Amino acid sequence: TFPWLTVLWAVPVVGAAVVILLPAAQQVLAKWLALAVSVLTLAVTAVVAIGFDPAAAQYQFVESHRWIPSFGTGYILGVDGIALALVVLTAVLVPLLIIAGWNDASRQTGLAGRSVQAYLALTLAVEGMVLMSLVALDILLFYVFFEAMLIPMYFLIGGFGGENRSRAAVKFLLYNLFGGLIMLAAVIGLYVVTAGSDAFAAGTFDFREIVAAVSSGEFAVNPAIMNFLFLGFMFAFAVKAPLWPFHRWLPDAAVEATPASAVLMMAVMDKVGTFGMLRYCLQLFPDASTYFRPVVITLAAIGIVYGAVLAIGQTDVMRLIAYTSISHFGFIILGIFVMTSQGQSGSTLYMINHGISTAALFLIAGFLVSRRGSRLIDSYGGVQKVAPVLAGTFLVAGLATLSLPGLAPFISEFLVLIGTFTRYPVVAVFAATALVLSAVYILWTYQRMMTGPVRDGIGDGDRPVRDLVPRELVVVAPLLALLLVLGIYPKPALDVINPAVEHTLTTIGQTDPEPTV
């Protein structure tokens, strides 16, 4: 059996090294090679998904090797439905981001002319680390790459991006790294607890073994210690996936970074936080997660509503999209921690759908912002007349983020809301208010920017808003097609997701409550 996951995560990294090592004069060849590497990673992901059997064992394509036995951590890769979903999302998105940021790094000077090569290599490295984290079945390996993938994105923000790129990058890296270090505390605590338990030959980081031990009850732990470890993991993932109120880093980073990098952050990278929640926080600390479920459920619902309200209140398009993404992550976490088959399956499908939808919306907004020179909502008007295709695609992406049933995200949001009510009715209604709030902050922005008289300098002047160029269409059309497909026919995704989620529930002793009737 070929080491499919090893190749999957290594190809982006090796390609990044090659691209950065390319001569400065090979900028165009560097772009094409980076795109080829991303497409090769996508092909690897495709073969993995096709070979994946959702009815088979929980983890497939499992590769195991001794990496650092001294730390009780091994190079253990393996993909389940949850991990496979995010792997597919990342693999499909990254090529689209590359062709979206095709010319983003052209304006940067210095750096020995490696600006384009540096940008592409950083993007590929982020892809590789994200994939490796998703496929990792070892707690310490997962944490290694979860914390590692910050620095390439830190460079990708601070390098390139807007005027405030420095401050935005610092806030990004410091929030996420404070969370990651708080994780490290809990990871070392977990190692200590496992070593102090007879259930394992020594301190262990093998995720599958620890999960089996905790589920079987052999690895009993003092509830306080498990609670603290769960709190550390949760804080780390909450800063990573912008769970309210730990979200405050995301808006600045998203606005300041280039649109492609911002999408890579929110659409792909931040999903790792929610995935880490769903997998580790639940399967390692089922008791602690159950105990804290009310608190984090309340936090996620507050995040949903609060992010929607702020998005309504934002005067900046990109910041508005960032807060929309925060609210959607609130949905994701709410669906994860309601511990219901509907809830968790919907949260995973929402990871996918929000990734694609935010990618589309943020990239279209970035194209529009690039046409002009300001991100202000009031800076635009009547853009439909000048750029019918740009405005139409923006409308479609907004409707996706608005959770129309004709588009994928609704199927997910609905699924989450359903799952929420079976356990927490009031929280479910409070979240459902975000259905109206999304209509508000999407359609009001569309009215402000796309409708009305063509504002000065939009259809004329030195910086007119020309319609989407063919490359931007290449970026957009696949995303809109994916949204439509996953809205109309989500089953292919759910068939993959539903088994894994069931296993997760089966592992944590949770089951969807039976109907009252």
Binding site: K171, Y175, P245, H247, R248, Y306, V309, L310, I312, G313, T340, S341, Q342, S345, G346, G382, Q384, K385, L399, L404, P405, G406, F410, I411, F414, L415, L417, I418, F421, T422, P425, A428, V429, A432, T433, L435, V436, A439, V440, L443, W444, Y446, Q447, M450, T451, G452, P453, V454, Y489, P490, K491, L494, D495, N498, E502, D512, E514, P515, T516, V517
Partner: protein, 625 residues
């Protein structure tokens, strides 16, 4: 055979092409849209005949296309239930939409982007067909939100006009509040019953409780208020007239507003077991009927007056549906008659506006009867239908609805009947107002307008709409054909003969005549003034749309903006404030500690001799801490 799903797949594909083909098909796209709407009508007719060719339970068609959301116990399967209730809406939607498409061929002929407009029309038709055809509430919600989107797009047409964009945004937001209510309904349904399909829900309907069933019914009623544009979610109709007249015709006559009535009737099995929900439905219907009639009395623009009339008629629908099985069939019949005559009225108004250089203020109108004979004739036919004159279609349907309302019995019966009678009288009054101000009296035209007769392409749909507004009433009402046809799906209440039908038929006619006389005295006997006259506080209130939009602005827009500002302040000062304070504390501590690095070797030596701290700590560790 012809699969039922083609009805949904027919227009949608059209829209898809018209949306993707772009300028490549701008020259002929409208032809494809109209052809596809006509094909949908043909398929609907064939399926209706097939249902007629079947008997009993075999009449209804159930077709599950595929498993759609197989998540755990949800197991929602995409399916269509084209039954006796569904087929009526299918025919109404397809036929009126095809007529409106043909009318738009000419109405939008002199406007660019006609292909995109017809793409939106096809998407609208597909969405509403999915709404009425889905056999489960999740597909119903899919069609519901698709119809919301289509209404936003069509109202939002002519986006260069800010009023149109604002109207589209308001319409979508209100309809999304309704959709939120419907989503809570579905969510409670799954929580309690564990199923979303009509069959499973209605089989488990007897269980649950009066409280739970009433909650479901009230949420569905909120959804209907959204789509049906009943209070408190009615304010969005007025501004929606900023869009092209065919859009208003499709939204009001059939489809958009029809969605709420369809939802109530389809959920009728739930409402029958939830009398409190039925009471809420009745209250909403009566209140919105009265409010719409009052607003229509004052509206000066023909579009606004017709929108108010549609609101009142949909209030009649909601009232009849809330009456239960005694009114469900009457609700549906009056809904079909309303589709016919209201579509005719809207198309006539659009023809008038096109002839009047896009003018919408009825003050500029006058004496249009002679100069616009065919449109005047069609508009008058629809006017008689909505008025409810015996020969006209709307007569029998409105009479049946009023009879059911007054037969509700007791205080409920008397109050509902009185509300319906007052609504009918006020309907007579304001429709007479519109007619007199439009087609009679002095010309009152401005800017040397040159009204011309509507083209054949627009005229023929108007004539067919008038024919429907003349026939449909007797066709369905007389003989109880609609009642018998809906009896299978809709529970048959039979009758109670609360009052001698003739007394109600006479009372309605008398109220209509009183309203007609009042309007003739005000606007026919007395010359129509060209300027807004001052009047009682009620007059200005109705002119301000009953100050309903102002209520939304003061409570939700203003309250919403206050909440948004508060949350922005919390984010900037409180949430970010904690991190800023932590960073400031670290910086202050860093500066303080760096001040310790005095640079004097002797100060460092003093700090080292602070190793007395180490010595005392080591010693005290033996002295019990």
């Amino acid at each position: 055979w012809l699969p039922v799903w083609l009805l949904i797949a027919l227009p949608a594909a059209g829209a898809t092409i018209l949306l993707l083909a772009g300028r490549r098909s701008d020259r002929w796209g409208h032809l494809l849209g109209c052809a596809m709407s006509l094909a949908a009508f043909a398929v609907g007719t064939v399926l209706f005949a097939g249902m007629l060719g079947r008997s009993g339970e075999e009449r209804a068609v159930h077709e599950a296309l595929f498993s759609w959301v197989p998540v755990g116990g949800l197991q929602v399967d995409f399916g269509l239930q084209l039954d006796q209730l569904s087929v009526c809406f299918v025919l109404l939607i397809t036929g009126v939409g095809s007529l409106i498409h043909i009318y738009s061929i000419g109405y939008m002929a002199e406007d660019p982007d006609r292909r995109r407009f017809f793409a939106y029309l096809n998407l609208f038709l597909a969405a509403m067909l999915l709404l009425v055809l889905a056999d489960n509430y999740l597909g119903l919600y899919a069609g519901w939100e698709g119809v919301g989107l289509a209404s936003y797009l069509l109202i939002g047409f002519w986006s260069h006009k800010p009023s149109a964009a604002t109207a589209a945004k308001k319409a979508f937001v209100v309809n999304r509040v309704g959709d939120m209510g419907l989503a809570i309904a579905l969510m409670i349904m799954f929580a309690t019953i564990g199923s979303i399909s009509f069959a499973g829900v209605f089989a488990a309907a007897p269980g649950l409780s009066e409280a739970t069933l009433s909650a479901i019914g009230l949420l569905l009623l909120l959804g209907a208020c959204g789509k049906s544009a009943q209070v408190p979610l009615q304010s969005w109709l007025g501004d929606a007239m900023e869009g092209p007249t065919p859009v208003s015709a499709l939204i009001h006559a059939a489809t958009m507003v029809t969605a709420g009535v369809y939802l109530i009737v389809r959920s009728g099995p739930i409402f029958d077991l939830a009398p409190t929900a039925q009471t809420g439905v009745v209250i909403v219907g009566a209140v919105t009927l009265l409010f719409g009639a009052i607003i229509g009395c004052a509206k000066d623009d023909i579009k606004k007056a017709l929108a108010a009339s549609t609101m009142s008629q949909i209030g009649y629908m909601v009232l009849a549906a809330g009456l239960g099985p005694a009114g469900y069939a009457f609700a549906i019949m009056h809904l079909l008659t309303h589709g016919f005559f209201k579509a005719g009225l809207f198309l006539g108004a659009g023809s008038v506006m096109h002839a009047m250089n896009d003018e919408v203020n009825m003050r500029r109108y006058g004496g249009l009867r002679k100069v616009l004979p065919v449109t005047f004739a069609t508009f008058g036919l629809g006017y008689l239908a909505i008025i409810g004159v015996p020969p006209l279609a709307g007569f029998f349907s409105k009479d049946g609805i009023i009879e059911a309302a007054l037969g509700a019995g007791g205080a409920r019966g008397v109050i509902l009947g009185g509300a319906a009678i007052l609504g009918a009288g006020i309907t007579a009054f304001y429709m007479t107002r519109v007619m007199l101000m439009t087609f009679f009296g002095e010309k009152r035209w401005a800017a040397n307008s040159h009204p011309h007769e509507a083209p054949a392409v627009m005229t023929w749909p108007m004539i067919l709409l008038a024919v429907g507004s003349v026939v449909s009433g007797g066709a369905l009402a007389i003989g109880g054909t609609l009642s018998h046809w809906l009896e299978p799906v809709v529970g048959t209440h039979e009758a109670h003969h609360a009052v001698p039908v003739w007394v109600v038929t006479a009372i309605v006619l008398a109220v209509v005549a009183v309203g007609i006389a009042v309007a003739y005295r005000m606007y026919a006997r007395q010359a129509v003034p060209e300027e807004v006259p001052e009047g009682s506080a009620l007059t200005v209130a109705a002119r301000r749309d009953l100050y309903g939009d102002a209520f939304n602005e003061a409570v939700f827009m203003r309250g919403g903006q206050t909440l948004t500002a508060a949350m922005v302040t919390v984010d900037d000062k409180a949430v970010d404030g904690t991190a800023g304070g932590l960073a400031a504390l670290v910086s202050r501590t860093s500066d303080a500690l760096r001040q310790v690095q005095t640079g004097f070797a002797r100060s460092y030596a003093l700090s080292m001799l602070g190793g007395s701290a180490l010595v005392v700590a080591a010693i005290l560790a033996v002295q019990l801490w």
